[PDB]
């Protein structure tokens, strides 16, 4: 749970 990491499905 870091805000700026990949927020997408894969």
């Amino acid at each position: 749970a870091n805000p700026n990491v990949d927020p997408n499905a894969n």
Partner: antibody
Amino acid sequence: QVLLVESGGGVVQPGTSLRLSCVASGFSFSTYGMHWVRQSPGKGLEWVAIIWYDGGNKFYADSVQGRFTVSRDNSKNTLYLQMNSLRAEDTAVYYCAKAYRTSLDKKYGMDVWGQGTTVTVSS
Amino acid sequence: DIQMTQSPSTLSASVGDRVTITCRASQSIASWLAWYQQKPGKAPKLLIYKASSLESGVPSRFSGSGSGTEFTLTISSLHPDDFATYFCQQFTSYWTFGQGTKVEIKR
């Protein structure tokens, strides 16, 4: 083409609640993180919230933490921003934005924004 | 908290002029910098991503440079459609924006 359209803005009384909506088309909504950003003359462009593709991870700006809640209904291709305990400093144009696509990068911004919806807090 | 500051705040230039906008971050953001263009009544539009990479459809007259704390956005020859407000944005720790640089038409 990727397109986002915000709705739900308007004139609202202080201390009340309001839910904004962001509708997505032209891409697989269920596979992308989504953002809310707001713009006011007083505070410029200010990020508000982000929600993960699956609706799980959610992060908020300090200015809105505890009062605003982000959600999404992937079956309706719709992103939501629930705003509670609204105050005058929340008056702004609220934009919704799509997270940048997955790459080898470890940090992610946003590419496409919507037209925006105007929220005016006034008595 | 990373604070982005831009310079100039307002610029008056003629069509065909070369314009350079500078953005400074309070701490090192490596190359996690993006440049947006915003016209009145319209949403911001992404022009450059990760400091130097031009987005699809953006004319090659736009270019970006820099790493760490100092970044620049360059328009080689201004077109009437380029007169707008330009924002920088860091995306390494949350997402914060500069105050904007308004490029107005000199006549």
